[PDB]
Design a protein around this nucleic acid. Structure first.
Lengths: 260, 203, 178
RNA sequence: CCCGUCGCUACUACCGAUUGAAUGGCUUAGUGAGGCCUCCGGAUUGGUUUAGGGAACCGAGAAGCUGGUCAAACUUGGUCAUUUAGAGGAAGUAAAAGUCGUAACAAGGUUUCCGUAGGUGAACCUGCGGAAGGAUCAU
RNA sequence: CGGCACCUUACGAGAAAUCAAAGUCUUUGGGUUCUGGGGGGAGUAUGGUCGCAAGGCUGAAACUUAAAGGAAUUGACGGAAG
RNA sequence: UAUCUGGUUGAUCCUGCCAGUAGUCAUAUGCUUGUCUCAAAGAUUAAGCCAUGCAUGUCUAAGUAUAAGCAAUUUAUACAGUGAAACUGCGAAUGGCUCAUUAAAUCAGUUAUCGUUUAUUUGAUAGUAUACUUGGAUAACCGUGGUAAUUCUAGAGCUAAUACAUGCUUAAAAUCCCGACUGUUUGGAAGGGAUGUAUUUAUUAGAUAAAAAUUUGAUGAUUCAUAAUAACUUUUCGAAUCGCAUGGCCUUGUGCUGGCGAUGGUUCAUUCAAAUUUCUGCCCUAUCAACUUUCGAUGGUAGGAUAGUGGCCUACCAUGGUUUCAACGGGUAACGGGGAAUAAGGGUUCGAUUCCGGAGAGGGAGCCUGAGAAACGGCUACCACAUCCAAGGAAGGCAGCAGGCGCGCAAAUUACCCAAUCCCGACACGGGGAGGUAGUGACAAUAAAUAACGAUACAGGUUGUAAUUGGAAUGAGUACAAUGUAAAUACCUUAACGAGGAACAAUUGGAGGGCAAGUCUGGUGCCAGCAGCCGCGGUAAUUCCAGCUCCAAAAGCGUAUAUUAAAGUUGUUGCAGUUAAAAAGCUCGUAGUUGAACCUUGGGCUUGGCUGGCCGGUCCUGGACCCAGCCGAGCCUUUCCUUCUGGCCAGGACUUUUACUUUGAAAAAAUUAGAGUGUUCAAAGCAGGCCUUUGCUCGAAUAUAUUAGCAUGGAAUAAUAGAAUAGGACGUUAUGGUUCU
């Protein structure tokens, strides 16, 4: 209606941001960027609601104006910059290196990684197509365009980005038994290995995955991200839980045992 | 102004639709260019997204092609001799897509003699014989005939197009849309596509 | 604008307005508990009925249902925590065996009476609203404050209360200073 | 116990001459603002710029103009819907049981009721054919 | 076999009279059509439709009212029988 | 809480309604009102009309500064700091309000764009065959002014850019076309043109069943991506731009080179969006049964227009399309949904309104700019109102914030502020009636005061009091102060003041029945009046008018209206139809609804899983064997269970359609249920808890959604199909023959 909206009501924000109902009327609207609005995280949310470094939305802005915040080794000056999956946030003033990866509970877990691990990332290949002058290229999940990839790279695969030169260090082929982290649905955050890919021509293909506790779930191919070539060897430091989804009773029993 | 929305229309059932909303800019229409033949007059139009359409009001020349032997040449366009949609488009010589026109054959005929060495039209009048002789008697190097010798034999084209060259005018069909692109291009009629167009033109 | 703040009622007036069988019973229950009005009975009645309603659904389920389990035990643990359900009555059937008298026995007003800090049950409510009794180290002046089992033993006079080692009140100071 | 004409009062609705009146929507036709496109046009204003005084010819180009297009608004007419007036007419209800009779309830003093057609101050009567919810389960 | 019915009984049903269906209906489900929602106003008005007409079919509202009615009991009454 | 009670009669059992009762995140109103948390609030009737003021502007080191601005002399006589005014750039298309129109429309869930536009963000992408850096205007500024009036502007004098218009700068070959001379059996070649990317044509790549006589990407699917060939273009752009350090090489010439960035820019991708669009689903009405189709209705062909598909429009040609499975028309006290009220269940009523989608800015209509508008806090025109006028003219749009009139049964202060949330800008700095805070507010909801305990005293069965006798406690309020806050008010803490009628006084209705609580006293005397209904009142009124007493609820209690339960009086669950209302006069009959039975059962064997024990092996708890049980399988039984290659997955070739049902994915947040968590409790909220932490640490679930669509396991139940003039099934490698790749 006459143009795009630039506002976001507090209740209209994505549920996984855990924004409180009575803080105010409006919520941070992510800008355009590498990740979709509903599947991303404004930087103002992260430095105020998770890390609690900033007590309000004003204090975060001064943080980024001192050039401390780096997304994937580059400075960002937009408080609402849409950080997303496998994104690396470095706050070298604190000497902290972050990687945004889902916990099993479906939300953005605070996952601290080593300084070396902050120098790469993994991206899901969206399409392989020939660009201008006969130059094939690859689009990753965050919209990165890498020219001259390995000619063996095809769709649904996961590549390793050097995160500095923008080139390809290695990639993981998509196949049976590949370690997978799910990034959508209510199976979001689960980690497992592919069992059988059922092809549905003209529709959505489903990926059958067995969890770490011999738990089987079926999810759409659009939510499937490869993180390791085989079981138990993820290319990134997986957060707490390792994508293992439990019962509510087990969580209560673990809660009962943990503090008492 | 002109709108392409289906709201003002009635449904497949035949029911009139109650007025939903006022007219919308993202679904407007515009006034036909009605391209004629004449001194070139083109008005650029601001369209959606900041893009530009080129309204051709009058054009004289266009890029016309031989698909059979792969030559495209820019040549004058005389006028429309047939339009499939409405026949008054012919009467007032309005240029749109798919119109059948006559264009001067000389820029094409020039390439034929340089490329193949023969002359088109095959007319047996005195002036045509003078043109026919001068082409084949022109000064060339030694190997030039040998290069033209290889192309000999395939230079013999279908009778209907060859007969046209005596009049110096070739039938053509406009391939572009003059009101959209600002050009009036086309290709030369050939084969059964041409012979089907000749059936009614001669009537 | 701002997201709505939800609210909900805590009581329900009975359908039949004047029934001396119910009219005397509510007087009898509140009279010996010193309850202020019938709303405090309508509150116990409504709040207890929904506890049964939660248990009623689970008993329709097949046993070992993890919702019947996880929800069933979670409800029971809360009830035993405040003492309304006996420690040997953890079967989800005794929850249906509850009565208004059980949880009113768990009130701050009731228990300060049975701990002897006030002579009468109405004097028990007076010690509460006049800010004299402290549970733990936090002063509570809510007559209806339900006392948990672990909070049962920590009810005593407030240290700044005149009856608990604090300074004299307004009346004593004015008279003793007159 | 009970029914109906007639009389009084009150209220509700209906029919009703007035080619009634008003309001609103839709729309035929007529006239038709304004914009937009288009066609010329060409106030002035720079020179593709060139010229022994300067003639040009190149570009931008305002008002205006021609034909179109979308079409506001009005006039006329038609239509649909909603309100509202009306002499008079003909009903219904209420009131209290005013006038005349006694139709029904008993075999209600001529058994009643149905359909239909005549008639009559009114209840109603009569014909013809039914029914028993009959005053007969029975010769 | 099919009928038109009749007598007794009530397993059962029903407010009862009664009912071999009016049973197999709070132990509520064979299929299916139609109809009613207190009494009047009223099968009236209006519109439509069928009919030569008489009329048929469809069919309100305003207003008004605490009752109208069904089966049976006792009594009272009868220009009914014994 | 799955509830009934009064009213037809002399009395009875029914049918049936009236009345009673309770709630309403439901309105108004009456009476009354002490506290704390929280908190709706001109929607209803008029999308009726508006006085006043505000509601969108914005500058960094990185666009343009000779303000005749300020300030100091400074690394500076091209400028250098700050910085009004303007040009340029971006935004003003969000936000906020209202719900008039609107009934396959909006909307919902779910699809597609191989049919499209997309500022911004984010990555990628450009050596293309005067240059030491080009021109001419122009604002602000200056000063001649005119109109009464306005965010009206007219001459004149300057001057500037990421504004306006132009314009070279660069590799190496290589290829193609033309091609004089020449070799003379077909080559060599001097000399010319074309090479990047944008536009538009046309033509070619864009391959893939395994042995015998060199490449080629994507898709389920393409004329797809890309490339090339021949050209075409009122020829797109391959930077004449801004800030800081100032380095390195010496051939010491203002020599050659260069780090971090601003801004810009072609195309691609991505992202914030947009626009269409697939399927299934919307209240009442048949006293709406046929509608659409000249002049677009249904389709086709071609074209135009569009960003693009498409009768969106035009020309020509057919006569189509919708409909009793309810089209079309009418009403709507109709924006839709998430949701709300009530509810044992099934349901009924409501949804203007804190979120999402849509529409509108008095009623239409048409456009400028812009990526984005048919925009109204943009314009133009008309209609209707309407403001000033000097009478010539000029200016309007609160269904934004507060506020004023009207209408009504019906609804707040012309307060403060960007501190919190977020948005916009040139952006660490400005703006924001967005948003937040306060004022009014018995819309609702939470918690919760008006007392307590003794001693006498009679009565009284070890104590429950009833009167006259006390000493305490405390907040209602009042206030230092501190906290609270952008600054305040308030809350909480708190010195001092603050209770005997603790006048610091609790009210709202009633007392015949329903329905709780009098046959007490006085007044009236069928009158006044009460009475939801039945009735009470005609001189002892249990019912009016008064007092006393008592009852129900309590800071709350009646009245009116609507609606839900009651109502099994709308009945799918779940009504009734002989006589109470109600079986069509009777047959035929169409759509519809419903339709006899019947097709692999049984047996046998082996095996996996969890219940009870026996084992007990007991810290309730865990093992084979044993008993059964309850499921899952795997084989043989004449055997369904697709079939081959690579070799239970991955690559192929085939399949009667379903209906139904398991599970999965989905069904936004809020709301509901519900986990955990002592907001002092609670309503809430998603916080929090830790021996007091230069930090450690559970969380912030999980259910319900339900129709449509997707996937999946099963084959009873209900259909659907096959082999009768055999045009039937197999020959896997059956024989040939016909052709195609």
């Amino acid at each position: 209606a006459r143009g795009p909206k630039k506002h976001l009501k507090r209740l209209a924000a994505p549920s996984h941001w855990m924004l409180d109902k009575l803080s105010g009327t409006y919520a941070p609207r992510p800008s355009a960027g590498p990740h979709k609005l509903r599947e991303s995280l404004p930087l103002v949310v992260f430095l105020r609601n998770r890390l609690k470094y900033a007590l309000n939305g004003r204090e975060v802005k001064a943080i980024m104006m001192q050039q401390h915040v780096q997304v994937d080794g580059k400075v960002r000056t937009d408080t609402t910059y849409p950080a997303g999956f496998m994104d690396v946030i470095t706050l070298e003033a604190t000497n902290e290196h972050f990687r945004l990866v889902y916990d099993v509970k479906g939300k953005f877990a605070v996952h601290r990684i080593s300084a070396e691990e902050a120098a790469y990332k993994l991206g899901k290949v969206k399409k392989v197509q020939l660009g201008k002058k006969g130059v094939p290229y690859v689009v990753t999940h965050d919209g990165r365009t890498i020219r001259y990839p390995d000619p063996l790279i095809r769709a649904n695969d996961t590549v390793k980005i050097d995160l500095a030169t923008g080139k390809i260090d290695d990639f993981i082929k998509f196949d049976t038994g590949r370690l997978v982290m799910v990034t959508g649905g209510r199976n979001l955050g689960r980690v497992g290995v592919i069992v059988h890919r059922e092809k549905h021509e003209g529709g959505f293909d489903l990926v059958h995955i067995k969890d770490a506790l011999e738990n089987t779930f079926v999810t759409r191919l659009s939510n499937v991200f490869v993180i390791g070539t085989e079981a138990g060897k993820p290319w990134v430091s997986l957060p707490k839980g390792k994508g293992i989804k439990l019962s509510i009773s087990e969580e209560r029993d673990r809660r009962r045992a943990q503090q008492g | 102004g002109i709108s392409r929305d289906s709201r003002h229309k009635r449904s497949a059932t035949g029911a009139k639709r109650a007025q939903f909303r006022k007219k919308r800019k993202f679904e407007l229409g515009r006034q036909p260019a009605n391209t004629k033949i004449g001194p070139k007059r083109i008005h650029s139009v601001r369209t959606r997204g900041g893009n530009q359409k080129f309204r051709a009001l009058r054009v004289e020349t266009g890029n016309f092609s031989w698909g059979s032997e792969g030559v495209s040449r820019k040549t004058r366009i005389a006028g429309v001799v047939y339009h499939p949609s409405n026949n008054e488009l012919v009467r007032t010589n309005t240029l749109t897509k798919s119109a059948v026109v006559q264009i001067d054959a000389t820029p094409f005929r020039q390439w034929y003699e340089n490329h193949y060495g023969a002359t088109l039209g095959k007319k047996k009048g005195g002036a045509h014989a003078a043109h026919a002789a001068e082409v084949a008697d022109a000064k060339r190097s030694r190997k030039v005939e040998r290069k033209l010798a290889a192309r000999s034999g395939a230079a013999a084209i279908e009778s209907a197009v060859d007969s046209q060259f005596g009049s110096g005018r070739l039938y053509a069909v406009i391939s572009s849309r003059p009101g959209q692109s600002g050009r009036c291009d086309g290709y030369i009629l050939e084969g059964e596509e041409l012979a089907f167009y000749l059936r009614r033109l001669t009537a | 604008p701002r997201a709505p703040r939800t609210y909900s009622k805590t009581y329900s007036v009975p359908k039949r307005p004047y029934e001396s069988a119910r009219l005397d019973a509510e007087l009898k229950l509140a009279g010996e508990y010193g309850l202020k009005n019938k709303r405090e009975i309508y509150r116990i009645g409504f709040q207890l009925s929904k506890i049964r309603r939660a248990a009623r659904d689970l008993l329709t389920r097949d046993e070992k249902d993890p919702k019947r389990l996880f929800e069933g035990n979670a409800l029971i643990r809360r009830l035993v925590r405040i003492g309304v359900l006996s420690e040997d009555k953890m079967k989800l059937d005794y929850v249906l065996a509850l009565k208004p008298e059980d949880f009113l026995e768990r009130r701050l007003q009731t228990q300060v009476f049975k701990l002897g800090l006030a002579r009468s049950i109405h004097h028990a409510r007076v010690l509460i609203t006049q800010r004299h009794i402290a549970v733990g180290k936090q002063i509570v002046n809510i007559p209806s404050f339900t006392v948990r089992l672990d909070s049962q033993k920590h009810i005593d006079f407030a240290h700044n209360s005149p009856y608990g080692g604090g300074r004299a009140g307004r009346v004593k100071r004015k008279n003793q200073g007159k």
